[PDB]
Design a protein around this nucleic acid. Structure first.
Lengths: 35, 106, 70, 98
RNA sequence: AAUCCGGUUAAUAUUCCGGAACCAGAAGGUGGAAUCAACACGGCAACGUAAAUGAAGUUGGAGACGUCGGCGGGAGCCCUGGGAAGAGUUCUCUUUUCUUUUUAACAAACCACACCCUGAAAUCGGUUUAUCCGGAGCUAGGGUAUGGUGUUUGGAAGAGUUCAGCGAUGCUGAAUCCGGUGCGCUCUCGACGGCCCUUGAAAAUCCAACGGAAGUUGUUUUCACAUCUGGUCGUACUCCUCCAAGGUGCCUCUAGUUGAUAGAACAAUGUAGAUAAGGGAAGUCGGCAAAAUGGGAAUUCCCACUGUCCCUAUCUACUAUCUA
């Protein structure tokens, strides 16, 4: 909805930003994983 | 043209009261008008009093004293007839008591 | 907005330190609308006599910022 | 009373229409009360000079009529592409090219 | 308690920009008002006004109250006469065809149901669309208040729109008008009349009254004006409920789509919809479905009707088929 608590805005933003491509240089430092 | 409500308070109710006006830009607009004021009512009889503007409760503070009361005993609280009835009844009761006390003392 | 018909009063309001700017409007009916901007109200004076408008114009204090047709 | 003037300076310069033509056509098409030549005293079409079409009327006479009537001969000669009628002023109508 | 208009974005607006307001609280100041006759005067009255102290204690009002019907008022929309502008149509006819023609919040002055005064009434008067009230004081006359509204402005043309041009998007012209209206639709207000019975929430909040504590320098002032401030959170976008044009179940304007995997062929099949000579329920357990209009008389009979049947035939779309 619209009348959303501010914690929800942080909660929604973090959940969405988890779906983000893992950087190329990240792989170059041995190993980094998903999920 | 079909017009939408300015607010987002869906399910229009008693509070949602609007007026259609034409703007200088040639647009029909909803203007929300607050409910009309209520004139004070007499305590004894209940008829609205005479000489008091019919405005909102919060608004009444802005008025001056003379604009909220009438220059008479119980002015702004009781009607003129109610005041007359109150005065004559009080005097007759007092006289009825004074004769009753006179009868008992003799 | 307040419409003022008393010219002297318009002068006194102008002399008041609250007044910031004044506007002169030339209408098609040859009226001059002296719109004086104050803190709370925009005081307008419509003068029908043309020479009255000019004699009004420099009687305004020089510190006040008068402006041409808006 | 009220006056209507149709400019014709451009027509005279470009020979699109001569003054005698506006004379003849306004006479035989002024449907004053539905009849041509019924102008009488109330309406007087007195064009002055070889550039003007002037009408003095004692009753209402919509300038929209004169535009419609001026469009008559304009279409007949088929110069509507090169010539149209506009309003310079209240009751004043003139002829524009491209 | 209190906000409107115009403009602005690729995407946000009653939030932003421009302009114009409003509310609430806060202090002093300025000016005005009242008093050693202690807290104002006027009017028969309803009540009026720039002000005109009010402790404790005691009350009253607003908030705050069902439903239905008709009438009246206003606004917007719809209808329409002209005026103007442009675009049409036009051999001729057609003063004609189509489209547009704006004023916000807010602030000013003025503009009509309850009550008062004179009055004493039936020969009953006044009066609703709907007979309601009147010695518990009618009609009539003069007032008081409530102003639903309307008038004139301000705001405000400087804005917006539409036409013409001339030259970063600027500049310059004009017009943006006068009506009429109706059981019209939408919304709201006033005045009634019923039905109630179920005689129709609460609180915050604001106001007033009774009450009379206290009190030359002062005291008060709910009067006018200036000055300041207004946090926190929601706001993008998607969709039980809102807005809902005209004309005669159809058509159209505004607006929105042209997407739903496509193409080619049209045999047989199936579905659907039709027409059919002569007969007319002979079909089947049977007038099931169609056409008739279904009808009449006691499930039956009579009459009518028809592809149900003899006996099927033809057409159409889709299906079905093949292709990507």
């Amino acid at each position: 909805p619209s009348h959303k608590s501010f914690r929800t805005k942080q909660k929604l933003a973090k959940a969405a930003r988890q779906n983000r491509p893992i950087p190329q240089w990240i792989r170059l430092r041995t190993g980094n994983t998903v999920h | 043209q079909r017009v939408t409500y300015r607010r987002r308070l869906a399910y229009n109710t008693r509070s949602n009261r609007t007026r259609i006006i034409k703007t200088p830009g040639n647009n029909i607009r909803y203007l929300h008008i607050k409910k009309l004021g209520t004139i004070p009512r007499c305590g004894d009889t209940g008829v609205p009093l005479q000489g008091i503007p019919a405005l909102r409760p919060r608004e009444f503070a802005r008025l001056s004293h003379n604009k909220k009361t009438v220059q008479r005993a119980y002015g702004g609280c009781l009607s003129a007839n109610a005041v007359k009835d109150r005065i004559v009844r009080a005097f007759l009761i007092e006289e009825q008591k004074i004769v009753k006390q006179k009868l008992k003392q003799l | 907005p307040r419409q003022i018909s008393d010219i002297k009063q318009f002068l006194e309001i102008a002399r008041r330190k609250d007044a910031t700017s004044a506007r002169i409007k030339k209408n098609t009916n040859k009226d001059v609308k002296f719109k004086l901007r104050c803190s709370k109200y925009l005081y307008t004076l419509v003068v029908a006599d043309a020479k009255k408008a000019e004699k009004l114009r420099q009687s305004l204090p020089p510190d006040l910022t008068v402006t041409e047709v808006g | 009373s009220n006056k209507y003037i149709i400019d014709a300076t451009a027509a005279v310069n470009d020979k699109i229409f001569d003054v005698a033509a506006f004379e003849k056509y306004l006479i035989d098409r002024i449907k004053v009360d539905g009849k041509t030549g019924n102008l009488g005293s109330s309406v007087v079409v007195s064009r002055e000079g070889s550039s003007k079409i002037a009408v003095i009327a004692h009753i209402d006479f919509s300038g929209r009529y004169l535009k419609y009537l001026t469009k008559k001969f304009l279409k007949k000669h088929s110069l509507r592409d090169w010539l149209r009628v506009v309003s310079t002023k209240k009751g004043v109508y003139e002829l524009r090219y491209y």
